[PDB]
From TrEMBL, chain A:
The chain holds residues 408 to 1041 of 1058 of the full protein. It comes from the Viruses. This is Helicase-primase primase subunit. It comes from Human herpesvirus 1 (HHV-1).
Length: 505, 450
């Protein structure tokens, strides 16, 4: 029926007063970060040159306290620099890299893919977004004239859609990178709609209206103290350019303002917001009749986009093959059509941690529960535990062999491991005479531990592989010790784990 | 010295021959501390605080004086000294999970009892000294004790000369704590006669209650004063009988009258006089600038929670108390956000004895700032990058500081642990036990910082 009450755990904290405005400034892009400004002011460079510019930035902050550091590290360090807040009138911490005293944090951090390759990270304090959206900006006269010609939300939206180096590649591919430190203010969903047969645009626009309806129902369910009238609440839709000529997939991006007075905090919280918005439109009748005959699968929303360091291609940008351009689905009772059209061009409407657009109270949905085990999975798990048996966790099984210390148990069985290496791989057996076990992966079902003494591939004869001992619980609650090797040569999937032998302990 | 020291000083043992007194900060009363330093110089011949405990007696003549003082005492205290084990407290007190009220409570203290007792025992062992002229160092201690109430400069000297002397001669501790044990015994004996009831304390300082009707105050002053008179006179009589004579006549201080009193640990006690709303909290560690705000929050929450004496079933009061305690925690963590960028405020003073965070290789570059670190290391735990929490020695970097956001998800957890001991103690002490007040910081209000 829409699911939300029975499969989500709303955890909010109300903050009224100065802590509301203070919290907002601390967790949202600065008021001028996404306010169109004449030119860019930021730090745009390839990953290599940014490691250097970050190293040199640390040498002007380490003197005054900054803990010293000893493409994931670069993104983490840039996000931490962008998140750091201004202490009074003193220039912010990122001012060392951006080299201006007018910089105001927090700030957006983007990733630019260049040709032939090269992830160029770019942290900006302001940018020429007026120029980027200028191509899809329709003048008030044009929208008003179209409204007079077609007095009908759907028809006008179909008509209004028809009328539409790292520093230079910033303007061809910019991908916003999720910052877990900041608070998310817009529900940005990446709809990857697979297509059996091509879908006409008239169909997609009617499907998108149904999606708006379902998503607004889901939003009024998730945020119960808000007021989402599902005929006036603005949802923004953006289609990837290919009449739709698309054959394989339709690229869609749906942006929703988080209704006041709510602000959503947490990657997992938006993972829920996205999974509640998915079921709503799947249970919706009109949407699955409108797009069903054309869609191969009903998996539309990708929920992994929301993780610190994961980027999402912004609208009004291409991919290095399709510039995301708005598709206008006017609200059925929208009282300002020209405003709605000239609302898709404002970067705040499509930024994860944008400034929220006199706050008395503010409710932060910071938890919608943990990983969603399907009522089907939860009921599947409780029913499997009652028919087949209990599979004890890794920690409990290891506890039997006096391990509360994994790197020491590994040493005792390392002899068995090296003996099987001598028996089946004797040409590389002696490299495994003096080895130190350093933890690699630590889970509740998997424990990978390396053996650095560049060792040799035991499968082919390509100094090419890294060895990893992996402990899991198999069979009748017995400990299975697997030697695994990750090589680099293409014959062996580039830097991919491959097992070679698995013995008991 | 490697491990440093409590009191700043700069000795002039040779060239140029001019004493130089370091007077730390204290701008408002700069003349007062200058006069205190001058008096400390003049009295103890300038040896203090450089020479140490040797101003009084050689560190090795003490083993003789302590033995010579264990003989001139009374037969009972002679054994009482020999049976002293660290923290024995052989006196009827309250169970540490307990609380009292509304009954007329009162705190008492003997100003400078360890120093005065040390002086009397030093005189008892004075005959045992090799040189009668070698007792001049035993005249400076009496000058300190005599002038202690008159001038506070002798005070800070005596609060450090005495504990350090007790470290110079380990055998003096078992003597001083046996004499104080005897004092506490007569305190308890005399207490019953004047309706006083020993409920807690640490020797020289002791707090108790009165078996008077808990509504009359005109006669309350009379009993509270007669108890002071009788206890002071009886303790003085025991000391005289123990041959130990004090230079400054003994005096008991009425350090406050209160109606409610709640204790959780051995040192943690909160007193509150409802009539005048005067309170006193002890046992809460002031390990930084945030702990003071936490203490204020606790002393307001306790003032509001013992104001719930409205007639109710005990079960109801437990819940309407826990709710208010959780609300106080909420208002504390909300205000914590508005000072998340004040690293100096979220700072902890680590001692050179406690386990300490490892020094970053860039704190060794403070120039003329590394010299200020003598006793305390002020550390703030910041969270660079992600996952890792690293310590920054605050006072070894130039100001204004630039830092990654302060890991309030570590300091607030520690402050909340202390506030939780105080609140588990009060919840399980006034109303029915069985409730460990825990605030779900990790779920309710963790998002603000992490
Ligand atoms: Zn290989």
């Amino acid at each position: 029926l829409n699911y939300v009450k029975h499969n989500v755990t709303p955890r909010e904290t109300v903050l009224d007063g100065d802590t509301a405005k203070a919290y907002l400034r601390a967790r949202t892009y600065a008021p001028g970060a996404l306010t169109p400004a004449p030119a860019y002011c930021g730090a745009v460079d390839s990953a290599t040159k940014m490691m250097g510019r970050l190293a040199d930035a640390e040498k002007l902050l380490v003197p005054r306290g900054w803990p010293a550091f000893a493409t994931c590290g670069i993104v983490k360090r840039l996000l931490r620099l962008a998140a750091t807040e201004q202490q009074g009138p003193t220039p912010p911490a990122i001012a060392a890299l951006i080299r201006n005293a007018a910089v105001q944090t927090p700030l957006p951090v983007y990733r630019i893919s260049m040709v032939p390759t090269g992830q160029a990270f770019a942290a900006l304090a302001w940018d020429d977004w007026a120029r980027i959206t200028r191509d899809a900006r329709l003048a008030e006269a044009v929208v008003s004239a179209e409204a007079a010609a077609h007095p009908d939300h759907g028809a006008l939206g179909r008509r209004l859609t028809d009328r539409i180096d790292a520093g230079g590649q910033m303007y061809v591919n910019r991908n916003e990178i999720f910052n877990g430190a900041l608070a998310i203010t817009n529900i940005i969903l990446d709809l990857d709609i697979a297509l059996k047969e091509p879908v006409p645009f008239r169909r997609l626009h009617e499907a998108l209206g149904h999606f708006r309806r379902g998503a607004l129902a889901a939003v009024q369910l998730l945020f119960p103290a808000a007021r989402v009238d599902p005929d006036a609440y603005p949802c923004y839709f953006f289609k990837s350019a290919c009449v739709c000529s698309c054959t394989d997939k339709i690229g869609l991006r749906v942006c929703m303002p988080v209704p006041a007075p709510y602000v959503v905090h947490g990657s997992l919280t938006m993972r829920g917001v996205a999974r509640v918005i998915q079921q709503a439109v799947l249970l919706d009748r009109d949407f699955v009749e409108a797009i069903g005959s054309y869609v191969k699968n009903f998996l539309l929303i990708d929920t992994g986009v929301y993780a610190h360091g994961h980027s999402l291609r912004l609208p009004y940008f291409a991919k290095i093959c399709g510039r995301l351009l708005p598709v206008f689905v006017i609200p059925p009772a929208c009282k300002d059509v020209p405003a709605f059209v000239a609302a898709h061009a404002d970067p705040r409407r499509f930024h994860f941690h944008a400034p929220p657009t006199s706050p008395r109270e503010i409710r932060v949905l910071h938890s919608l529960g943990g990983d969603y085990v399907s009522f089907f999975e939860r009921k599947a798990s409780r029913n499997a535990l009652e028919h087949f048996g209990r599979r004890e966790t890794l920690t409990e099984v290891l506890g039997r062999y006096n391990v509360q210390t994994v790197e020491g148990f590994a040493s005792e069985l390392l002899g068995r491991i090296v003996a099987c290496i001598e028996t089946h791989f004797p040409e590389h057996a002696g490299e495994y005479q003096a080895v130190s076990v350093r933890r690699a992966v630590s889970k509740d079902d998997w424990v990978l531990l390396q053996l650095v003494p560049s060792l040799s591939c035991l499968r082919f004869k390509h100094a090419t592989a890294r060895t990893f001992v992996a402990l899991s619980v198999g069979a009748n609650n017995r400990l299975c010790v697997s030697l695994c090797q990750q090589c680099f040569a293409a014959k062996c999937d580039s830097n991919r784990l491959h097992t070679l032998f698995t013995i008991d302990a | 010295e490697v491990r440093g020291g409590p009191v700043p000083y700069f000795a002039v043992l040779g060239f140029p021959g001019w004493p130089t007194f370091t007077v730390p900060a204290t701008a408002e009363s700069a003349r007062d501390l200058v006069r205190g330093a001058a008096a400390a110089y003049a009295a103890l011949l300038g040896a203090w605080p450089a020479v140490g405990a040797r101003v009084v007696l050689p560190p090795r003549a003490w083993p003789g004086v302590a033995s010579a003082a264990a003989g001139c005492l009374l037969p009972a205290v002679r054994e009482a000294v020999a049976r002293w084990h660290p923290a024995t407290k052989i006196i009827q007190l309250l169970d540490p999970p307990a609380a009292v009220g509304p009954v007329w409570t009162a705190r008492f203290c003997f100003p400078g009892l360890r120093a005065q007792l040390l002086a009397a025992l030093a005189d008892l062992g004075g005959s045992g000294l090799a040189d009668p002229h070698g007792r001049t160092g035993l005249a400076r201690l009496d000058a300190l004790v005599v002038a202690a109430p008159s001038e506070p400069w002798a005070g800070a000297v005596l609060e450090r000369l005495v504990p350090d002397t007790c470290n110079a001669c380990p055998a003096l501790r078992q003597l001083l704590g046996g004499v104080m044990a005897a004092v506490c015994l007569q305190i308890e004996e005399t207490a019953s006669s004047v309706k006083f009831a020993v409920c807690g304390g640490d020797g020289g300082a002791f707090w108790g209650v009165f078996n008077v009707d808990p509504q009359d105050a005109d006669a309350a002053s009379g009993v509270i004063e007669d108890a002071r008179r009788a206890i002071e006179t009886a303790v003085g009589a025991v000391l005289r009988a123990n041959a130990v004579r004090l230079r400054h006549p003994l005096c008991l201080a009425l350090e406050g009258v209160y109606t409610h009193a709640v204790a959780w640990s051995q040192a943690g006690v909160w007193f509150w006089n409802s009539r005048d709303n005067t309170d006193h909290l002890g046992g809460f560690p002031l390990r930084g600038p945030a702990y003071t705000t936490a203490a204020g929050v606790v002393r307001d929450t306790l003032r509001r929670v013992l104001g719930l004496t409205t007639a109710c079933v005990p079960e109801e009061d437990a819940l309407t108390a826990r709710g208010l305690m959780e609300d106080a925690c909420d208002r504390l963590i909300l205000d914590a956000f508005n000072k998340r960028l004040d690293a100096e405020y979220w700072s902890v003073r680590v001692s050179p004895f406690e386990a300490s965070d490892p020094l970053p290789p860039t704190a060794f570059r403070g120039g003329a700032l590394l010299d200020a670190e003598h006793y305390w290391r002020r550390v703030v735990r910041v969270c660079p990058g992600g996952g890792e929490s690293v310590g920054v020695p605050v006072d070894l970097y130039p100001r204004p500081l630039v830092l990654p956001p302060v890991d309030c998800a570590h300091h607030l957890r520690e402050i909340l642990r202390e506030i939780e001991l105080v609140f588990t103690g009060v919840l399980a002490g006034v109303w029915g036990e069985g409730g460990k007040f825990v605030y779900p910081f990790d779920d309710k209000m963790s998002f603000l910082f992490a």
